[PDB]
Design a protein around this nucleic acid. Structure first.
Lengths: 64, 117, 205, 146
RNA sequence: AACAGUGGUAGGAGAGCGUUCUAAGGGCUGUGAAGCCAGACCGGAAGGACUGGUGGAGCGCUUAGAAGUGAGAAUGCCGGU
RNA sequence: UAUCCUUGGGAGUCAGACUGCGAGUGAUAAGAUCCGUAGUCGAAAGGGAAACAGCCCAGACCGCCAGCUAAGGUCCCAAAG
RNA sequence: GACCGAUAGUGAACCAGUACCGUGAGGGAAAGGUGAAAAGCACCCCGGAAGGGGAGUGAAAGAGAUCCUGAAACCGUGUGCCUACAAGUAGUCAGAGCCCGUUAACGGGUGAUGGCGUGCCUUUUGUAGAAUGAACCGGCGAGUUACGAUCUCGUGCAAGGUUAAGCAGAAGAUGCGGAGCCGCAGCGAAAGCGAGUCUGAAUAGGGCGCAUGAGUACGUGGUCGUAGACCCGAAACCAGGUGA
RNA sequence: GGAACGAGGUAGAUGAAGAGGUCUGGAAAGGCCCGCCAUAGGAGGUAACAGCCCUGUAGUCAAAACUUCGUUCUCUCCUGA
């Protein structure tokens, strides 16, 4: 049996040329009056998965 | 393919039992109780190889001390005089003399006794 | 490679220059090793299987209640601890086959042929012709060629006379140019070819 | 080689690590699973992204975007691979597939200027880049389109 | 050669021993195979020989390969005592 | 004085104990409990502390019937005043 | 058949789904080997027989009806050394005496007496442990296989590597088969652009990328994933049946 | 529905070559020295390991009767631009 890809993480992440994983931030859904515009401009931007998490999950994304 | 393992186990265990001769009954007749004594005998043997060096030392020393007490000295005072002289032979030799050739022992003790003064 | 030629009689004649690309090349023994194991494995048959604790007959009931007895917990009389027992992992039918890449396998066969021409256990022999299909004639030929051991024989289009002969001999095998292996080559210690078959193998290689 | 002098290339082969086969091995009595716990059991473990009830990473993160049905992943040439061709010769995706330059045509062909040229060519493709076609006509070629 | 070092659980790494089978090559065996019992032999270890006895027909060695590959414990299973 | 950093593969661990020092809770009681800090044990044999995981001394490749010392000791058990 | 070889392998190599258990459905065993050939022990004795000792057959009777070998636990016979004022996880080291004489080497068996010394495994902060497990001997008995991913090592070819199914081919190797797959260019949610791209009003800055390039196929090994997935072990749940 | 023909299955037949000699041995398939057949060296058995001892193998042949397939013929039925 072929490995099954983890579909939620597939919907959330994207792969890079250097093998890193692009991601979005949290705290960016619905409750913004309790946050500074500084946070918000920082958080609409993208991010990158950390090493520990990457170690945890990368086997779930070999098939991208 | 399948593998039984008939001969190896028997051969190994018998080797152990041949090592375990002379032991009291079941400890030479039975494999595993013998194994756990043989092994124990190994630790005891290691220990005793190093206790010999500690025991014969004592024995030599007692002999030397007796001979020096009849010569009119103590072991400690003697060996101090000897190291002070240069007579660093060793205790095993001294004991062998004190048993066999006590005159030589007296020669040495007289040297040390003189050089203590 | 400018090796001698021989007749079916065993008499020498003018030599033959061979395709150095196929024969005049340095071998690669790691490659040959890999190919040999591959073929040696592919010839397996995989008819090895045993009975799991599920496949074995019976079991089912808890032979005795979990508690109250002085005996040990046991779930079935067919678990591996037991005399009858089901095997834990054991064998099971499969295939040991695998395939290499084409460049590698052709390099392998080229290499071993190069080695044969090096150590001079190779013989070219045009025009194998047998009025009969007999073995006495073949063995006489091999005697005339001083072939006292295993041997491989090659044709282009399956001389059935030569195949009917030469099989009753133990150490001898026969094949066409299309059916060449590395394993047969290695195993049979000496090689007999028709120059026709030479042109075939060297043009497909 | 010979069957009775075989040997592999060093480093190609290794012995497998058996476990539960004594303590001199260093893998006896536990097979390197250590002592008790959910990871030491038969079938023992957890699913990979699991974190012990902590809300795992992907769930705490949001989804983003979608996929188009009508996407085009054109096959890309980067304009240095063209120097392998002869001067003045036409070029087509068919020709590239023939040469093996392109192992797959995916909706068309695009050319890109990660290189340079020393050749004029009568190129025709599905789509071009600005730098690419300029480099072509600068070398003296042309920029036809399919 | 010199220098330095060499306690060790979990655990990581590396070197190997041994068992069954297969391929090839070279062998042993009714002038006595394997197996079994002795022995004061050899090797750093796993282990390996030699001699004698029993037994009365199959078995090692080398290089590789593949594994139902090594048991002292499961209130383990079976059998025997 | 040689270990430091990065990347990658593989793990195990998340019940800790005592002792000394500084603190808390406690009754300035607990071989208590909880923290910090250093050590030892754990995972470390050996000598002493009678015996005696955690104290004192000290770190085991192997052998030797050689010697110098540490802690602790020198009337006999038991080597040494 | 790089499948088993009588605890294995069909439960079952033998009169087995038998014996046996159960009201019943149902459960469910054990147990192979004389010898080349019966030539299977005429006859003599002991004995009521059985069972022996001779003789004889046979290569072999130490082969004699559980009939190839025949281990260990266990059971006994005889004897070289030791032992009835001694306490001892039962040994080790030292060591006298006595008895022997080897795979001939600072040899062997016993061992009065002295010294040191609280078993093995598990689990524990820590166990001689008055915590667990094992009566003993023997056998069997636990990290594997497929598929896929990833890392390392190796090999081959390299900006190119590779075939799958399938056809032919001895269940094979091989050839054909390039459909497909990975990589060579990425960025962006996407249109799309392109060694740049996205954001953005922005030729700004910043992120990701290139310039600082090597992958790919196969194999070994490690690890992971999905499958009973290191082995044994529940109480229990469901379906269908058997039983007043 | 029927015949004919061909092939095959359901019993089978044939089928080359050495007691070769000599040493052990209880007995040779074994050892040594020699020969032979092979479209047959596949297997099993025979007092121990057999190409040439037996049954057999390769190859070539074979069926009264019942069956399987195939070909042809009879037999049937036929219109479409």
């Amino acid at each position: 049996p072929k490995m099954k890809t983890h579909r939620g993480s597939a919907k959330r992440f994207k792969k890079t040329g250097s093998g890193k994983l692009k991601r979005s931030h949290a705290y960016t859904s619905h409750l913004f009056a309790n946050k500074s515009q500084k946070q918000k401009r920082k958080l609409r931007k993208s991010a990158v998965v950390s090493a520990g998490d990457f170690k945890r999950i990368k086997q779930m994304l070999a098939n991208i | 393919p399948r593998v039984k393992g008939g001969t190896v186990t028997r051969k190994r265990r018998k080797k152990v039992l041949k090592l375990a001769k002379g032991y009291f009954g079941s400890k030479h007749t039975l494999y595993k109780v013998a194994n756990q004594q043989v092994m124990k005998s190994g630790n005891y043997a290691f220990r005793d190889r190093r206790q010999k060096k500690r025991d014969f030392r004592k024995l030599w020393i007692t002999r030397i001390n007796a001979a020096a007490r009849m010569n009119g000295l103590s072991y400690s005072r003697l060996m101090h005089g000897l190291k002070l002289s240069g007579i660093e032979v060793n205790r095993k030799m001294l004991a062998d003399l004190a048993v066999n050739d006590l005159t030589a022992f007296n020669q040495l003790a007289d040297a040390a006794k003189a050089q203590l003064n | 490679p400018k090796v001698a030629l021989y007749n079916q009689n065993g008499s020498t004649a003018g030599d033959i220059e061979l395709n150095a690309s196929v024969f005049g090349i340095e071998p690669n023994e790691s490659v040959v090793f890999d190919a040999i194991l591959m073929q040696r494995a592919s010839l397996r048959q995989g008819t090895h299987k045993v009975k799991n604790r599920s496949e074995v007959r019976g079991g089912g009931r808890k032979p005795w209640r979990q508690k109250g007895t002085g005996r040990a917990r046991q779930g079935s009389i067919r678990s591996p601890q037991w005399r009858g027992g089901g095997v834990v992992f054991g064998p099971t039918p499969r295939s040991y086959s695998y395939k290499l890449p084409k460049k590698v396998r052709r390099l392998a066969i080229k290499s071993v042929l190069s080695s044969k021409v090096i150590d001079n256990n190779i013989i070219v022999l045009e025009d194998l012709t047998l009025d009969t299909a007999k073995t006495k004639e073949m063995a006489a030929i091999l005697k005339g060629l001083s072939v006292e051991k295993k041997a491989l024989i090659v044709t282009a289009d399956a001389n059935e006379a030569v195949a009917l002969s030469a099989r009753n001999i133990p150490g001898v095998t026969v094949v066409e140019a299309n059916g060449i292996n590395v394993l047969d080559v290695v195993n049979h210690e000496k090689l007999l070819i028709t120059k026709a078959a030479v042109e075939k193998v060297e043009e497909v290689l | 080689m010979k069957l009775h002098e075989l040997k592999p290339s060093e480093g190609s082969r290794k012995t497998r690590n058996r476990v539960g086969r004594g303590i001199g091995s260093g893998n006896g009595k536990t097979a390197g699973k250590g002592h008790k716990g959910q990871n030491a059991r038969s079938g023992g473990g957890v699913r990979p992204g699991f974190e012990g009830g902590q809300m795992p990473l992907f769930q705490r993160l949001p989804k983003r975007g979608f996929t188009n049905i009508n996407r085009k992943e054109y096959a890309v040439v980067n304009l240095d691979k063209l120097n392998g061709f002869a001067e003045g010769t036409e070029v087509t995706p068919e020709l590239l597939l023939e040469t093996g330059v392109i192992s797959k045509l995916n909706a068309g062909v695009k050319i890109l200027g990660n290189g340079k040229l020393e050749k004029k060519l009568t190129v025709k493709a599905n789509k071009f880049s600005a730098s690419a076609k300029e480099a072509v006509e600068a070398a003296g070629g042309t920029a036809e389109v399919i």
